[PDB]
Amino acid sequence: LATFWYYAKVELVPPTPAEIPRAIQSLKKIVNSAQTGSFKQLTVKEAVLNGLVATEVLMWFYVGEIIGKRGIIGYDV
Amino acid sequence: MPQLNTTVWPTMITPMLLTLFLITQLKMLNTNYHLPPS
Amino acid sequence: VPPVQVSPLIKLGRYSALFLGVAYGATRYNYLKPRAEEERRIAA
Amino acid sequence: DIDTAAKFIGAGAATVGVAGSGAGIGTVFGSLIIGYARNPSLKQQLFSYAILGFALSEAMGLFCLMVAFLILFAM
Amino acid sequence: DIDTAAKFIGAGAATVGVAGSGAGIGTVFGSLIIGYARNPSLKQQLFSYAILGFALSEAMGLFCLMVAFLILFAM
Amino acid sequence: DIDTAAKFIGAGAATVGVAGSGAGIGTVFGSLIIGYARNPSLKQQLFSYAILGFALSEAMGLFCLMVAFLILFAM
Amino acid sequence: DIDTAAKFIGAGAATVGVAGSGAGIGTVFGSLIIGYARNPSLKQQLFSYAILGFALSEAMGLFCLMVAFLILFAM
Amino acid sequence: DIDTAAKFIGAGAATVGVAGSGAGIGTVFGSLIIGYARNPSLKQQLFSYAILGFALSEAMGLFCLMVAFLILFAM
Amino acid sequence: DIDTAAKFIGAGAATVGVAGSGAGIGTVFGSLIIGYARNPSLKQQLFSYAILGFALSEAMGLFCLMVAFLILFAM
Amino acid sequence: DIDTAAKFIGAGAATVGVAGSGAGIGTVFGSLIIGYARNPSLKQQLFSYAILGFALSEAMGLFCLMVAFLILFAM
Amino acid sequence: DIDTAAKFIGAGAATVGVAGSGAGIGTVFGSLIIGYARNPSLKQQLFSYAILGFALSEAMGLFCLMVAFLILFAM
Amino acid sequence: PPLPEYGGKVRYGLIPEEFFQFLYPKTGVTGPYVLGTGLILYALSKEIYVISAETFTALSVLGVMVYGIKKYGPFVADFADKLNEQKLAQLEEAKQASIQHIQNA
Amino acid sequence: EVKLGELPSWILMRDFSPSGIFGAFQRGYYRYYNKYINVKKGSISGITMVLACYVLFSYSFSYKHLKHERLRKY
Amino acid sequence: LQSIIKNIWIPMKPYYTKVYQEIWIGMGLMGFIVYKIRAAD
Amino acid sequence: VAYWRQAGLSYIRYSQICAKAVRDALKTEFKANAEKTSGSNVKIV
Amino acid sequence: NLFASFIAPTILGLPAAVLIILFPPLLIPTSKYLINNRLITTQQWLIKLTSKQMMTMHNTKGRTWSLMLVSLIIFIATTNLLGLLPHSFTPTTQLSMNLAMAIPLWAGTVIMGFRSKIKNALAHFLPQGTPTPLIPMLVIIETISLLIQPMALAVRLTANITAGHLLMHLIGSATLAMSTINLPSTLIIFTILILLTILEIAVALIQAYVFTLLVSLYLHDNT
Numbered sequence A: 001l002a003t004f005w006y007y008a009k010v011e012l013v014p015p016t017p018a019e020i021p022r023a024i025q026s027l028k029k030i031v032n033s034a035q036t037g038s039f040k041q042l043t044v045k046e047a048v049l050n051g052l053v054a055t056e057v058l059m060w061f062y063v064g065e066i067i068g069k070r071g072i073i074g075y076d077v
Numbered sequence B: 001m002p003q004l005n006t007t008v009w010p011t012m013i014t015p016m017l018l019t020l021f022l023i024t025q026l027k028m029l030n031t032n033y034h035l036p037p038s
Numbered sequence C: 001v002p003p004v005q006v007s008p009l010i011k012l013g014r015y016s017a018l019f020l021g022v023a024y025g026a027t028r029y030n031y032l033k034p035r036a037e038e039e040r041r042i043a044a
Numbered sequence D, E, F, G, H, I, J, K: 001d002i003d004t005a006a007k008f009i010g011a012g013a014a015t016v017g018v019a020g021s022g023a024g025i026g027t028v029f030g031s032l033i034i035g036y037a038r039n040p041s042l043k044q045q046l047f048s049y050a051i052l053g054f055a056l057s058e059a060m061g062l063f064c065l066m067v068a069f070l071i072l073f074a075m
Numbered sequence L: 001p002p003l004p005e006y007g008g009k010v011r012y013g014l015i016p017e018e019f020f021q022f023l024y025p026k027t028g029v030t031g032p033y034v035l036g037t038g039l040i041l042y043a044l045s046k047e048i049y050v051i052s053a054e055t056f057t058a059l060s061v062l063g064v065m066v067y068g069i070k071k072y073g074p075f076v077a078d079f080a081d082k083l084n085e086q087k088l089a090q091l092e093e094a095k096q097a098s099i100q101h102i103q104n105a
Numbered sequence M: 001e002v003k004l005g006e007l008p009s010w011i012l013m014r015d016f017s018p019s020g021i022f023g024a025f026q027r028g029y030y031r032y033y034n035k036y037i038n039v040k041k042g043s044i045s046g047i048t049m050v051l052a053c054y055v056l057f058s059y060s061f062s063y064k065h066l067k068h069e070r071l072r073k074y
Numbered sequence N: 001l002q003s004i005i006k007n008i009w010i011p012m013k014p015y016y017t018k019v020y021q022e023i024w025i026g027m028g029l030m031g032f033i034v035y036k037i038r039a040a041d
Numbered sequence O: 001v002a003y004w005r006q007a008g009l010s011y012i013r014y015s016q017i018c019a020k021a022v023r024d025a026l027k028t029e030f031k032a033n034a035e036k037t038s039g040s041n042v043k044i045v
Numbered sequence P: 001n002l003f004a005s006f007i008a009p010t011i012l013g014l015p016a017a018v019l020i021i022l023f024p025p026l027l028i029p030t031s032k033y034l035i036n037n038r039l040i041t042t043q044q045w046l047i048k049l050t051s052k053q054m055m056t057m058h059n060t061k062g063r064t065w066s067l068m069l070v071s072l073i074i075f076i077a078t079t080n081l082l083g084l085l086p087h088s089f090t091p092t093t094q095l096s097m098n099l100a101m102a103i104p105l106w107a108g109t110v111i112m113g114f115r116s117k118i119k120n121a122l123a124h125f126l127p128q129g130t131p132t133p134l135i136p137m138l139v140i141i142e143t144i145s146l147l148i149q150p151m152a153l154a155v156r157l158t159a160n161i162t163a164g165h166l167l168m169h170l171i172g173s174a175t176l177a178m179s180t181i182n183l184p185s186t187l188i189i190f191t192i193l194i195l196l197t198i199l200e201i202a203v204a205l206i207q208a209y210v211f212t213l214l215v216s217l218y219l220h221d222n223t
């Protein structure tokens, strides 16, 4: 109804270009975690959380995969 | 009929006996109904 | 409960992988569509 | 093959026995209607007999589905 | 040829089992007439038992159309 | 042609299912004569349960005539 | 020919549907005796039910003879 | 000769419809006992119904034996 | 040969007619117990019907055991 | 061989006559419950009618089992 | 080759005599419900007859199931 | 020791609320929900959960279950309480009486 | 205990004895039982969450069979 | 291996010895059937 | 067991209403005469 | 391919059919307390109502089985009900398990009718008011049916859960086929599957009560 739309209008929307700088900033954050090894700093509590949100965003690639072929259950042909 | 494949019968007989006769009953002996008071 | 601002890289990362999907969904759709019809034809 | 063709005749003939148990569930759930209009205070004890009569008659129909499936699939 | 033929001999001979559901529905709605003429105040309690006794007849009537289906299509 | 020959025994055996809807319409109108002798004041409401019970038993009988007219004419 | 041999088993099986209208007439004219011995003042109305009930019972029984005489002779 | 051998099946299977009458005559003469044990001063008129029922069911038991003798010899 | 084979299938499918002479003998002696427990003052006259009903339903059973021993021994 | 083959369908279909003595023993011992719920002071005379009806209905069952074991091993 | 094909038909026919016990056990427990609702102070003695009746009707049906296997497996 | 009075506040009877609060901060209110639709549509697209005959026997036994809970839940919910506040009262009552039989004595 | 640790040594720190992992289930059971079941005024969700984790197990071993019934091939 | 006596056999003592004594005589019959059925297969 | 018997009544109370109903349907030529030949006067202490 | 839901389940080469047979007792928690939670309050009530049903009809020696015949209706009614879950492997569709619950409880019932009280058990084969001249026929019935009662139990339960699952699985496949065809028909084939699931719920309990009643009635006739 309107409740799902009331929340969508904030985070289910295309991003602003002003957030791209700080987005790649965090991108450089985790890459320096790959250079020296700040991944060792991660406790399991949020470690899995970063993983789920990664699977979260990954499914966007698959719901986009099915809309690029106009088919739900596998490839139509 | 896969019920007739007698090679996996001892896989169904022994864990049943270990449940119908030892584990389910043990949990019944823990269900007691005390007599009512005066 | 008020909505929460999601982290930016995740916020565009949705649409980042989204258009990567509809593209990957376009390529393999147009890559498998021809390959299949002869396997269906040669099956006769 | 006459051997695999004769399976379909026996399997199709074996399952006729379900006509019996299909006619004994109407007697039970018909007697419950009669026996409940005469002593509607026993509603719970009659229904506890319509259940035992249901399962013990219906069981005799499935003994025909047993041979309907023992022949059709497991020789 | 005989394999695809021996199915109509087995399929048709399997849909006989719904004869028992034609007599089970008679005895059910035949006792609703006897049980209601006895206690015409329970017209809505009895009729809900007849629908129960009628539904349980299709149950044993479907066990036959299953074996009448398997023999016919999923041999 | 052992194909159309088996379509005869199919319809011929699938129509034996009507032997239920013959002995079910006997128990509906039989138990209407009994139930109406007891409470003849409800002549109208009993006869409204006979027609309902006669049709529900005859339906299960026409489904056999519908099946016998498929194995014979349709396929 | 085999069709001429299948039409005989097809007809000799359809006439088994008459076994229903033979046990369904004994339940109509058997429930007139029980229904008339109780209230013998309604003989002229219980009867006019045992004629409707007897006509709707042999009807579903003569179908299986019409089917027999439709397989055996008339295609 | 597969047809002359088929007549022994269609004529031996048509004569099982008699098992319908034989069950609708035990209902009639089992309703004459329940209806005479209640109002025995009607013995005259009850027995003239246990004959109309006996001679209307056992007529259906003869329509089967009529086709059993129509396939066995009249063909 | 093909005949001496079918003679056993016809004589077997014909003695199924006794299945209607077993449900009649059951209903007759099932009403002799109900009718005599209601009016035990008629023991000798109710039993004089349960012998007629026993002999008249079992007369339709002999008609099937006879047509069985006709295809089996006569022709 | 076709004799040793058909002698299995014969002796296999002759034993359907036991379907009679299945429902004849169910009515005798079914109405004995209704004959006893009415006049329990006759328990010795009723039960002696049930055993007579159980032994005369089952005897018709044996006559079928006797034939199936006659067209199998005797000749 | 056909000697085994006939053991799938002779065994599919022998097992339909169980239908006589699906209707018997229904009449036994359709009378334990009626008979109880009339004299509910004899529950201990009616149930002791419904079991004797359920065991004696089932004992006839299981004779068919034993001849079903004694043909399908022994000879 | 006395039992607590409430359980785990589970939503849809399948996912406990310790999950939604665990993902609420970084991903927001609709965070976990879109994960569900994100996994289901992925599952039945790559044929992880293959639609079979069991799919429609799943929805039925899940439909009857979710309807038996909604229709017969509250009745069993309190019936399990009335069995206690009866057995409780049945004790406290006799407990007081057992004083009269010793106070009068 | 985990949910606050960060080290791969924790995997080897644990007591992997026949009596060791049992005490990790018997403690994993009483931590669940005490949370959703063993409370007055508990709800049915203490059970309908066990069955939901019993279907996923009843489906996991049944996937080797359902894979022969896909309606696509890619 | 204690409390396998106390929790697991002390309760079941009056049953596994006196009441279910004839059950085991039947459970031997069953084991003979299962092996025989598997022997002819 | 009829509905009134389940409702607590007795056949005396059943008969008192059925007989009252017949008199209430009598014609005025007989209704006055029939009501006093069956009216009640006894009273409970 | 059709009887797939009845083959012994194995995951990663492990016989997972043991973690499924041992699970039903995990849904029956117990407590020494006097006033517990809603689960054990409802369960301890059902066990009270159930035990008062099967066991009231017994004498003092038959009531020593009041732990067996109650811990058996609880194990069959929980194994069947855990079979209606999707994809679940219900081990009561197995002729092996069912023959292992049927033979001991039966053999251990007639043995105590033959090892003790035998002279009385010899009188059930001959009913009370039986005339003599046809006894040599009745002896066959009361023995050959006795010798087949243990196989009546295990098959009355096997063929009723198997056929109940086969039907629900076929009617299920029907709705899948008519899904891509006229849809208002799919909703009538589906509502048949719903009435069939409400039936398979009842027959999940009825087949547990009848199994443990016929074992009770055998016991009552031997104690």
Ligand SMILES: COc1nc2ccc(Br)cc2cc1[C@@H](c1ccccc1)[C@@](O)(CCN(C)C)c1cccc2ccccc12
Binding pocket: E018, E021, E055, E056, E058, E059, E061, E062, E065, F060, F063, P188, P189, P192, P195, P196, P199
């Ligand atoms: C409406 O009829 C019913 N009522 C029921 C009542 C209770 C129960 Br629990 C099951 C019921 C099932 C049905 C039908 C149905 C409709 C749709 C799908 C599945 C089943 C039915 O099974 C009839 C059953 N008889 C005849 C044996 C059927 C089967 C197959 C082909 C049919 C064709 C035409 C009509 C009915 C057809």
